[PDB]
Design a protein around this ligand. Sequence first.
Ligand SMILES: Nc1nc2c(ncn2[C@@H]2O[C@H](COP(=O)(O)OP(=O)(O)OP(=O)(O)O)[C@@H](O)[C@H]2O)c(=O)[nH]1
Ligand SMILES: Nc1ncnc2c1ncn2[C@@H]1O[C@H](COP(=O)(O)OP(=O)(O)CP(=O)(O)O)[C@@H](O)[C@H]1O
Ligand SMILES: Nc1nc2c(ncn2[C@@H]2O[C@H](COP(=O)(O)OP(=O)(O)O)[C@@H](O)[C@H]2O)c(=O)[nH]1
Ligand SMILES: CS(=O)(=O)N1CCN(Cc2ccco2)CC1
Ligand SMILES: [Ca+2]
Ligand SMILES: [Ca+2]
Ligand SMILES: [Ca+2]
Ligand SMILES: [Mg+2]
Ligand SMILES: [Mg+2]
Ligand SMILES: [Mg+2]
Lengths: 349, 438, 425, 54
Amino acid sequence: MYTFVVRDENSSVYAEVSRLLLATGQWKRLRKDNPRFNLMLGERNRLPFGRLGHEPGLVQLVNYYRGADKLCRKASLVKLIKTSPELSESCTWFPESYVIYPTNLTDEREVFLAAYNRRREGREGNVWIAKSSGILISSEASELLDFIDEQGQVHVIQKYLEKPLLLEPGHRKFDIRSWVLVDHLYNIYLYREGVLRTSSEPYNSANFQDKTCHLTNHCIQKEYSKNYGRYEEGNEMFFEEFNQYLMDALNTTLENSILLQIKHIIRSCLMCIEPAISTKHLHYQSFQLFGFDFMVDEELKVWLIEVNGAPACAQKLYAELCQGIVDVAISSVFPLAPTSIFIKLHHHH
Amino acid sequence: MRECISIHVGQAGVQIGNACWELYCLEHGIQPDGQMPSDKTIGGGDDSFNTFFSETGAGKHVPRAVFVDLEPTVIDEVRTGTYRQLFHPEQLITGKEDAANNYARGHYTIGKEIIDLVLDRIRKLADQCTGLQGFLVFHSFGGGTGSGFTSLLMERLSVDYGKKSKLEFSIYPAPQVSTAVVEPYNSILTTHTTLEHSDCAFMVDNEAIYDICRRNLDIERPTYTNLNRLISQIVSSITASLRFDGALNVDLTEFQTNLVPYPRIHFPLATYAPVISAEKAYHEQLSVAEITNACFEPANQMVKCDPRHGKYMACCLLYRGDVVPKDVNAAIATIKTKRSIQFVDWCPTGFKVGINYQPPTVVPGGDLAKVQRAVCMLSNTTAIAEAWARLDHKFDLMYAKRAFVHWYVGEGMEEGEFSEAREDMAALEKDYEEVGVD
Amino acid sequence: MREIVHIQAGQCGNQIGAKFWEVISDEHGIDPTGSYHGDSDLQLERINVYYNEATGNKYVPRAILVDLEPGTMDSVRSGPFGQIFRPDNFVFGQSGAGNNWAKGHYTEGAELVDSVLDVVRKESESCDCLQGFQLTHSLGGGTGSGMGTLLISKIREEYPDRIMNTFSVMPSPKVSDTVVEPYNATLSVHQLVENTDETYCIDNEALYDICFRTLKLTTPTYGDLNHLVSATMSGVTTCLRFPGQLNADLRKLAVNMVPFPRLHFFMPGFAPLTSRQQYRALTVPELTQQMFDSKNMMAACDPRHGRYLTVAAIFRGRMSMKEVDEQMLNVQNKNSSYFVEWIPNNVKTAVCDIPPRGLKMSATFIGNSTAIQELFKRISEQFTAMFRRKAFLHWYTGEGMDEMEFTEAESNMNDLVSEYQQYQD
Amino acid sequence: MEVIELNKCTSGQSFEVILKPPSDPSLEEIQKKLEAAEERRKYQEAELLKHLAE
Ligand SMILES: Nc1nc2c(ncn2[C@@H]2O[C@H](COP(=O)(O)OP(=O)(O)OP(=O)(O)O)[C@@H](O)[C@H]2O)c(=O)[nH]1
Ligand SMILES: Nc1ncnc2c1ncn2[C@@H]1O[C@H](COP(=O)(O)OP(=O)(O)CP(=O)(O)O)[C@@H](O)[C@H]1O
Ligand SMILES: Nc1nc2c(ncn2[C@@H]2O[C@H](COP(=O)(O)OP(=O)(O)O)[C@@H](O)[C@H]2O)c(=O)[nH]1
Ligand SMILES: CS(=O)(=O)N1CCN(Cc2ccco2)CC1
Ligand SMILES: [Ca+2]
Ligand SMILES: [Ca+2]
Ligand SMILES: [Ca+2]
Ligand SMILES: [Mg+2]
Ligand SMILES: [Mg+2]
Ligand SMILES: [Mg+2]
């Protein structure tokens, strides 16, 4: 009989994972403060990694890689790409970004303005975006820096994709969410199912004020947009439909024009930090589900927007994925008495 | 030459001490009777081995040690063991009844009635020293004498020997070989009252030694003998610089300077490699790089914890055997490119290297196999504070219900000394976090 | 040299004490005359914990025999190892106690207690370093119950910093001598709560059920009940009588088992327990599954009705110490909802190389469980069913007692039950 | 990668490599504490005896 504890009640993912575990009859949940556990569904912030792997007889497993925040933080991600030779500052799949500390607190204010005055001088598109861990889109550098000083937390300004790939009909923006699971062996598995969180408003490049056609967030489209649910159900187009579209319209497949780059980007990021977060020779073991967000330009080039370390899942895919998390992440470490739903990304450990 | 007095307190301290002086003698060519053939100066001399061994006119090399236990059954083994002839009886101090795993009993009730006797015996060793450096104190955290009496001793030593240094070898409680439920209480109590009196302390977690013994030596259920012969190999590596010719860590003062830039943060992490089973058919000898790289694997750290997710304040490599500086730097360069080594901004990113050409001595019939070269890394990581976190957690669980507190109050200790000690650890954990995280 | 002084009082005390001394005398190689004839140095390593060494290499148990009538002790003197006890340690009267707690504690007993302490003091003065005492007695009778607690109160006065340990036979209506046993048990339990550091609660119904159901004895007897108590007493004391690390000391066992002063009442257990398919070897997994089985416990309480504050397990024999750790961890990890989460690692395991007589290996269980409150409720309930009608009180008031005292003992134990209740949640 | 302070002797050598530069209670007070706790033990035992006297 395997045992587990739950330290994140707000997790829709591992809530269903806990539902499936008990459904097997071979798992038993414990109070969130019981140290004798096989598996910890730990909290988001301040997970006590230092108390793991010190229970004699109990092999202990947790669903969070200690140190992955370096990859799942706006300012941390940028700092990781500009400093890691494996990614290099010349990384071609990550928008030109800079870390900007508000003036009420290193900081890349001057480095950002240099590349700005260059673009503004070369007649080139000089639209940028500012965000943090409240977003502002503007073409003038004065409005971006003034917006961060009004706050009190670190911000990041990166190039805004002026030429996104729009779905027809609708002339609308979108972003692709791919779920990636890394197990204790550090095998990289890509869930065969993705989701396109699409905008129901025609993309308008001459007005970055109305952030309804530029931001594809599932909450902003369902709160500030007026065409929500028009084309696809809940502004969520799955890989089956999006693939058929790329064929009829563009005469290519989601595999060739987009997925190859997505799998290349997922490999480069995770293989990069492997020496820092791997639990190969650790007294405890780690796995973690990641949520990658990508953009696509009219040239069918993929760009990395951010990585989410505690992502939620599309309503239509909670069963398949959660059952998959148990097969490859939990049963592979605590077996029970296909056609895998994942795409292994082999690499040189 | 400046002498070093070693003090062994409680069962753990005594047994570990007994296993180190066995190794010291084997290393310096001293026999069980105290004779030393290679020592060509009879009855004196200021050699490097003299920092740990005094000499008699008859040629006996006597350890500059004192063994103190509130119960005689453990020190009685020393009096009749292989090395019974090394010590004279004044060095072996024993009481009648122990502290019963009660910090307050060792510190107050029983400690008060024997502290003046220990000091007197230590004074006799001091009077033999022309230039005393300090003391090395071996004790356990969880034991009642090892915790309660050691803190009382450390207080008086700071009073009677002000300008002297004191280093600790401390055994961290591990349930797999622990015989007490209240060891978290004792560990935190003794850290609170000792913190301002210890200049540098090496914490060995029994959990780490225990699993090294099961993994590397294929011992299914390790005994204290197994645990101690391994601990004395590491301790020998840390104390070698004091007992042999050299220019690094030559005296006790240099440990604080090289390893402790801030007083409260004086708990360096120790890693050791290679540990090979003597029962093995025959092992392929590891290289300088291979054993250096092994210093960054948690599996051979004296306390399990992830230095990758901390920050270094000082790193020190101690090699024994066939090692030349060129090979060491060749390995460091390689490891810097493949490992996560993050120092603090106010420290140099470097390593102080010491090499001793004599390879590790192995006790005949022991568990370890003879190797051509071995290294012991002393690094001051913020990651070692994970051990504080683990310990403080268990404290909070029991103290929140006042469990077992009545045993301590019954010995004269006030309940507020618990919260007073726990608040100190709260400050210790915060210090590590201020230094390690961004 | 950590000496323990033994005291057995009353009919039950002396009959169980005698068998105890009969069982461990065999383990340490001592014959009925006190001559050692063992084959292992481990038998003598800690022999002086319970035995004194006289002239001629004779070993005399450090035990004092007490009672208010001569009958039971006359038998011990005639029993198998009766000749091995020190003649001067037989202290007895002639009146008896009539199963009356007040007679053993206030009238008949007071007349004889001073001469018992004269013997205890004489045994203590000869100890290099006395740990504490252990008393064997029943709580339902008059001497072991009334005078027994009286002795403890006076021992704690003359040795206030020594450990007081008792094996207490709790009364049960199913295995009863008289109807006043709940009266005598309630009065003693208050003295024990106040003046002992460890008390092994042995319920006579548990002993009965184990002989009838498990051992398959068609008609149990006190003699059969005392066999179990002997084996259990031998087991719970293995830590003291042989070389070891855990609970090898009276005070150390208290420090590890008693998180709160008043909650020092233990449930003992023993394994194996087999009827006569007796030669079958017992595997470590089996040995552990039984030791934790309620049917192998002798407090007649259900552990799954409370929670374990602490536990002390002792495995005897030549076995896989690695396989023991595995099974002990499997028990705690497969049923971790019956251990308190605010005492980490509250289960300690000890090993002994010497097995009990006639067994390749065995395990003894010592549990500090909040479930023991079920025992104190049985006694309390039976007490109130009589005291509410003041039934049988005249036996006691005739010895100078007032009803107020009964009302206090009743309140004192209901408090004890409430104390156990706040820690079960 | 710089080597500094190389010291060589017959039984070994030691050096330093820099990859990168940076960016009590008196005797009186102890005796009182030892006697303070002893005073709280005497008190606790007197109450025990006082109790046993009643
Ligand atoms: N590594 C190692 N640990 C030991 C050894 N002996 C005891 N310990 C540990 O020390 C802790 C108990 O403290 P002890 O040193 O035995 O107790 P003490 O200092 O003698 O004080 P008392 O309570 O009076 O016995 C337990 O966690 C043991 O695991 C030993 O020889 N080697
Ligand atoms: N450089 C850029 N170019 C184009 N669009 C961008 C962009 N940066 C952000 N966006 C838009 O912002 C949205 C994502 O914002 P972001 O992910 O930074 O905030 P967030 O992290 O709170 C949402 P999530 O739930 O995916 O984490 C996407 O829909 C994308 O269209
Ligand atoms: N297990 C066991 N219990 C006994 C024995 N003799 C008496 N008892 C129990 O002890 C209680 C009677 O006390 P008893 O010892 O006879 O009175 P005392 O001689 O005045 O102390 C009753 O509850 C009996 O069940 C015995 O030999 N074995
Ligand atoms: C011989 S008897 O008089 O029939 N008998 C009556 C019950 N009593 C108590 C008892 C029952 C089982 C064991 O002990 C023992 C003596
Ligand atoms: Ca000399
Ligand atoms: Ca000082
Ligand atoms: Ca009379
Ligand atoms: Mg986000
Ligand atoms: Mg001890
Ligand atoms: Mg009777």
